[PDB]
Ligand SMILES: [Cl-]
């Protein structure tokens with residue numbers, strides 16, 4: 245306990261979460277080939293698909309206009325029962341990310357085969373500020389083991405808790421392998437492998453808030 249300075253004494257949490265079908269209610273391959281997703285790409289032609297991952301995306305303000313055209317304004321009278329609302333984050337997921345993206349002691353990594361431009365447009369449509377979105381680390385190489393392994397090697401501070409969330413068993417298993425290969429043990433890991441729509445975001449919010457005063 246011998247230390248020459250005061251050092252901050254707060255817990256640290258690291259999140260590795262999938263996006264499509266974990267944060268949203270639709271799996272990746274039920275998302276990126278739809279007319280709606282394809283309409284966000286430059287050069288879109290109705291009933292034509294372009295590479296979903298590498299085709300340049302329309303400007304953010306255009307993507308926002310397309311989200312609003314599809315779903316209306318994400319304001320207080322937003323229609324949460326409308327068709328295709330499963331493309332979006334649930335209200336429980338929205339509340340979770342507002343909490344963790346304002347908490348400097350929580351590092352939020354989204355590990356995905358989707359793309360940062362799309363994820364940022366979803367958060368933006370759903371009321372997140374640029375400041376909040378800038379606290380996301382989006383890892384989109386497509387190989388989740390390498391993405392988590394490389395990220396946990398970064399000289400960040402060691403977590404008291406690591407969250408792993410994924411609706412795909414194979415991708416979950418890769419992230420879990422990477423986390424255990426960086427020295428974390430079972431009581432440090434909170435792993436959730438659920439089907440889309442079945443993640444208890446409000447419970448994870450309560451469990452994360454329990455750690456901080
Ligand atoms: Cl823009």
Ligand SMILES: [Cl-]
Nearest residue numbers: 272356357358
């Ligand atoms: Cl993915």
Ligand SMILES: [Mg+2]
Nearest residue numbers: 262264265411
């Ligand atoms: Mg998924």
